[PDB]
Symmetry: D2
Subunit: 338 residues, 4 copies
């Protein structure tokens, strides 16, 4: 029977994850039975239904009362406590917590759900410290059913890793530089305001904002042969969703642009089907909203110089594509449950 | 000698106020000696100098250490405590606190600065309850030197009131409706997220967001004859700064557009000089950045029907113009410090 | 059998109209057989399918060659000539031309399609001079089957007129002021550049840009009792689509907000069904994308002072809603093709 | 005495060039005496003074009549003819034409100014065909005084070339990939509309838009040893001005990030002073508005892997910094006039 899931943090990723599940609900091993968030159920049902990016949820009615959010007859219990130790996970029989607050990414933070009664936690972000990290289509079959806390990495890592994996196997990646031109996120400020990062303090819709990213080093955890070989940065820019990765690799086997493209295309039809999509179309960021792939290779932009310097460019829907992956990782854990 | 001022909340209004004061510092009866804010002095010195809206501060060098921000040799002490009861106002000899956090606008909230030792508080927002409210150029000469807590109203009210006062005295305002088309503010969300107001919850730079405003009722507190005669709404739109008021009045004395324009132009040259600016130019919001007036009447947009229904439109820089008026109100209180 | 329609100008309105028709194609008396536009069929097929605002067209396959656009097997002939006198309207047997270029809105301009062979022209904009103007749900039943050139007015007029008509019949509108806070359009500039209107010359996505509008006077042509009683302005703001009308009326019959709301709700359920939608929800512009109504009354925003000064606020999707009404007007003309 | 200059095309670059000159007018060998543009002098004086990006021109009064634009007593003659063969260049004694329309970048196009009577033309864009290309601080001392038509290259080339030149001399560039994350320009569409490039057809303020750029190949013309070794792309993003270049080079001499930074910093103090600025500050795009350097190296973002794969990141103000360079190239030509 079903794995009972709770969502902790009903934010952009929490609510995209819930909409992904509501559309794949008929063939799932998961049942979302609870949400904890700092707001109330009426606010949250409103935001679940009325989304500036995804539009109005159509498939089922979404309603709320003091206690619950109702999404097409399914009643999802709600609570509101900032400290996960106090959560009613035992009383609700929660198996798996989708940890989407952004604030409990270390083992000590995420463990508080275990001590409140949950059996496992899936963190929708890179882990801090020693937390096993999975990227679906790259290393998710190495999942160890005895792990209690896992990470689904970041959106950028889920875009980059599959492409790196295909290029590494075909050409041998020796070193690699990435830049993601990335939509702003809720971590940034609307107008100039205090922040730990002096660049992310700055009005997000008016600026190109450079920032660091662990995505390129995190690829080394999911593809252990590349540990320490990749580095990169992020530029946040004034769009609200959809991002793009530009990756330049120094490879061992000399090649040309048509061959790099052919290798990716073959992978997108076979071993990376559903993970990498190969696009030959001249599209822009709006067109990739709602796309289900982790990475959409923009084949016209591929270029190679001197045999060994390879550049590829891939799109990702950082909210929705990432949430589809969280859901796939969760379904995978449900099918391998101990 | 000088009135010693502390800023509580070094946000958009706090930092605009500080820049206003640094440029009018030679003519001033105030001396800013302290800042309380939830962030540290190095962050705040960086944000003071580097502003997405105002640009790089040029007049003087701005530096910081653990304890202080230095703005052209002047040392501004810094502290960081969310609870104003704990603040060192007696120890720093603070006379006047500029209350710019947005969070202590009731008498009970603002009184915590008195009990920490400040002699007076000027709230940079409408007051809740019974707090005397002043709009410079409308009723600031009614200020009573024995008042310990005052409000400088909102940006919208400072734009609307002077125009209303001139139109009321010339034509007799019987009723009036206002809509402000207003730049987004820090109160709104960057991407759809929880908020007390379900409209302000929504991505601010992607949406037109209606909201309620007390600006129109607050005009009745500064022009007591009009209490209960005005109402209005706000539409937040995707610009970071500069706003516009549209005001439709039912008046007693029949008139036409040219005459309504002439009455405002006359007032802008005499009794409202420096408060209302009259513009015959066809400008857009960007052109009003840094403008010092509380209201800039856009004269081409004035229209009248049937003698008695009058529409006027006025611009305001909601951050900078408003902060100029906080500074004027403070200088006025300094000059009458009995 | 079918009325053969050609689209002249395959811009935002032309392409929205075509999508409207492709989704209502089974119930239709029209058949779109031709397009004239300044660009070629491959470009136009790409733009028809890939739309930043509407997303990717899903219902049918859309393809092109040198001569034609194919939308689900239906072949739409294409030509590219700036001068409508040269167009092959007789040769293609065109009955009705949808004039959507923005450039042939006078009788003399629009008559060039007649002289090229079309039997009638429907202008997707206000007409200049003496052109009969229809707003569906307000005066479209006065359409006269012998009229050869008609106007569907503007988006703003389609939003404002039905509401005015309901309020006039219930309360007696004596005078009225309108401001539309309107999404930017193709008529404006991306960055400051030359334009007939010095305000529209200015960077559209960075500014609030006031402009004149004939929408309020045009309400007098569709509701002849109100000719000369209404006036208004527009403020263009940095959203790409969806607009809002704010209307302040001086009325004869004293009233209050609840009653004004009840009169509009009643009309939305009966005589204005499908034209006015009544909303009690706290939504923002993004939520009205794709909405089929000409006006969506935002009921919480309704306010009344002194019995006789009434403010209402209504949303409209200026591209899609308006195009639905062009399609309805065209279906109406088809049904009465005497 | 003075070189008499005319501006053909009074667009973003034409008007930025004019403001650069008005501020450096006291030590110049150039005198701007005429403008040709498709609009009239009153429109153009308005746009010259009221700029959404640069703000209100302060230094001098700017006025216009039917014939002329006046900028602080200096009367600049205006004409309006799309075809440069008809221009009054002989009658106005024009020596140098600043060709800023974007439409006369080939030798045959630009020569029409010579045949109207001008002696030289400086194209504010890459040339098509065999036109000598200069980048100030890279190859401008190779100017040949007998050349009648020159190119100042693009904004991206002016940012990239100086940095490439310093890296090549210190490390030996073997191959190099660039991506510029670039503000939208007037070449793009405000809302989805026809364009030769199917990506630039798309709403520029709502999308990340990839496009090709000749900047990386054009570096090979100004640094002839690197011909054919560089390639790259552009991503247009929703900011109106200021751009950033990300450059990844494969170099011969093994190095680390601190050494790459030290070499650039030393060049910025000496041979590239005024061309490259070295910044150690954590700033965002808004902060670089109005910056006079061709390239501002963001030193914190530099990274190196395996000795030979080097990434650097540099900002540029694509309007203003580029126009300063156009002015410097023109002054250089004036000082070497034959
Ligand atoms: N593009 C993306 O948005 C994206 C993609 C991949 C991963 N992520 C990661 O997913 C996580 C969430 O990011 P997001 O974009 O949803 O941010 P968000 O701020 O929209 O969502 C966080 C939610 O958690 C709530 N919250 C905060 N602290 C809480 C607490 N102690 N208890 C309960 N609820 C709490 C917030 O109110 C909000 O509802 C972050 O770790 C982020 O790094 C984001
Ligand atoms: N257009 C405008 O921005 C505008 C105009 C007029 C009035 N106001 C009003 O001015 C006030 C502030 O507006 P803002 O736009 O500057 O907001 P903001 O969020 O930029 O500023 C608030 C500042 O105070 C800090 N803060 C919050 N709680 C605190 C506490 N308990 N102790 C100390 N510091 C705290 C924040 O960290 C921030 O630095 C509000 O009352 C607002 O309504 C704003
Ligand atoms: N919100 C709106 O967009 C809106 C709403 C209602 C009405 N309108 C009106 O509809 C009309 C078009 O608006 P739009 O927003 O679609 O503009 P747009 O610029 O997107 O569309 C015009 C189209 O016609 C083409 N064109 C221009 N001149 C031509 C000629 N001589 N021959 C053939 N084709 C030509 C353009 O290339 C473009 O494809 C205008 O009259 C406008 O006022 C627009
Ligand atoms: N970031 C930048 O804007 C940038 C930087 C470097 C180079 N450039 C180049 O500078 C040139 C101008 O670009 P821009 O951004 O000023 O564009 P723009 O469209 O703002 O300026 C072009 C001007 O020329 C006018 N014009 C067009 N055709 C004409 C003709 N036949 N005769 C006279 N005037 C005519 C236009 O009306 C406009 O005033 C282009 O070649 C562009 O590639 C642009």
């Amino acid at each position: 029977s079903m794995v009972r899931v709770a969502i902790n943090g009903f934010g952009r990723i929490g609510r995209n994850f819930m909409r992904c599940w509501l559309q794949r609900k008929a063939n799932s091993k998961l049942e979302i039975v609870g949400i904890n968030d700092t707001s109330d159920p009426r606010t949250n049902a409103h935001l679940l239904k009325y989304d500036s990016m995804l539009g109005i949820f159509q498939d089922a009615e979404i309603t709320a009362d003091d206690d619950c959010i109702y999404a097409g007859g399914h009643a999802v219990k709600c609570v509101s406590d900032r400290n996960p130790e106090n959560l009613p996970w035992s009383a609700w029989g929660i198996d798996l917590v989708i940890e989407a607050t952004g604030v409990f990414t270390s083992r000590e933070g995420a463990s508080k759900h275990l001590s409140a009664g949950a059996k496992k936690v899936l963190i929708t972000a890179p882990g801090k410290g020693n937390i096993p990290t999975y990227v679906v289509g790259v290393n998710h079959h190495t999942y160890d059913p005895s792990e209690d806390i896992v990470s689904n990495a970041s959106c950028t890592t889920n875009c980059l890793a599959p492409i790196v994996k295909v290029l590494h196997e075909a050409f041998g990646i020796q070193q690699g530089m990435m830049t993601t031109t990335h939509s702003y996120t809720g971590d940034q400020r609307l107008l100039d305001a205090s922040h730990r990062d002096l660049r992310r303090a700055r009005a997000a819709a008016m600026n190109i904002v450079p920032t660091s990213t662990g995505a390129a080093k995190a690829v080394g955890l999911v593809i252990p042969e590349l540990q320490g070989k990749l580095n990169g940065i992020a530029l946040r820019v004034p769009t609200p969703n959809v991002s793009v990765v530009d990756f330049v690799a120094q490879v061992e086997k000399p090649t040309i642009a048509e061959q790099v493209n052919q290798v990716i295309k073959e992978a997108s039809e076979t071993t990376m089907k559903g993970i990498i999509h190969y696009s030959e179309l001249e599209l822009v960021s709006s067109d990739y909203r709602g796309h289900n792939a982790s990475s959409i290779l923009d084949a016209s932009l591929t270029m190679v110089l001197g045999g060994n310097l390879v550049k590829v460019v891939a799109w990702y829907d950082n909210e929705w594509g990432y949430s589809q992956r969280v859901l796939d990782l969760a379904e995978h854990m449900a099918a391998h449950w101990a």
